């Protein structure tokens, strides 16, 4: 689930 941080999430 490191790909969540690669892909990002902001709004």
């Amino acid at each position: 689930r490191e790909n969540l941080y690669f892909q990002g999430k902001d709004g």
Epitope: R1, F6, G8, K9
Partner: antibody, heavy 116, light 113 residues
Amino acid sequence: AVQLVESGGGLVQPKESLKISCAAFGVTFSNVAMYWVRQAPGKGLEWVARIRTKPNNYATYYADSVKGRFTISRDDSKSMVYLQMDNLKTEDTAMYYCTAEVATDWGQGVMVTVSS
Amino acid sequence: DVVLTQAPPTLSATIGQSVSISCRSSQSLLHRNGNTYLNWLLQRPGQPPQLLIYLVSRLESGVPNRFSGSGSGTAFTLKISGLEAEDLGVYYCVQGTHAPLTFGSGTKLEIKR
């Protein structure tokens, strides 16, 4: 392995200040909005402050109860998030947790107690 | 802010029984990117929250097979299939699809014995 580690916090008098921080390890947090979340003793979890990423101008937002007293900031070069808490009130007494908008990884929390 | 209505507030059951918790959202949690950022957290007394389930159904590393999450849109479910003694504590749903992060009010699980 992803990890968040909080520091700072302790006992403080009403109207005093405290700065707590959150160090991220193991993968960049640059692409995620970051949050401080708190839990008053025996209560549930609630967001306190929010900071956006560089593309969104690092915009900051606050729960109504802390607006104009708490300031959230991040230093992406150091993988650090901070909460400056000014004019502290007894009802700010809580465990404070740092987390990203994906809400998958959590620090151990720091206790902030506000009492005379 | 998105309201997560969590039910029931308490659960009690014997070892080996199944229990379910409901998390119902005021807004669809499907993000425009296609992911649904709804997770389930467990908090043991005097401990930080820890991740059980993320992105609706994905099991966190180290979490036993008996935990499962499901749902879509505005309605979600956590199920424990065969309670064990160590499963007690407070369960919360949390969403990060729509900023700010918001939380259900928590379900306290007790064991009947």
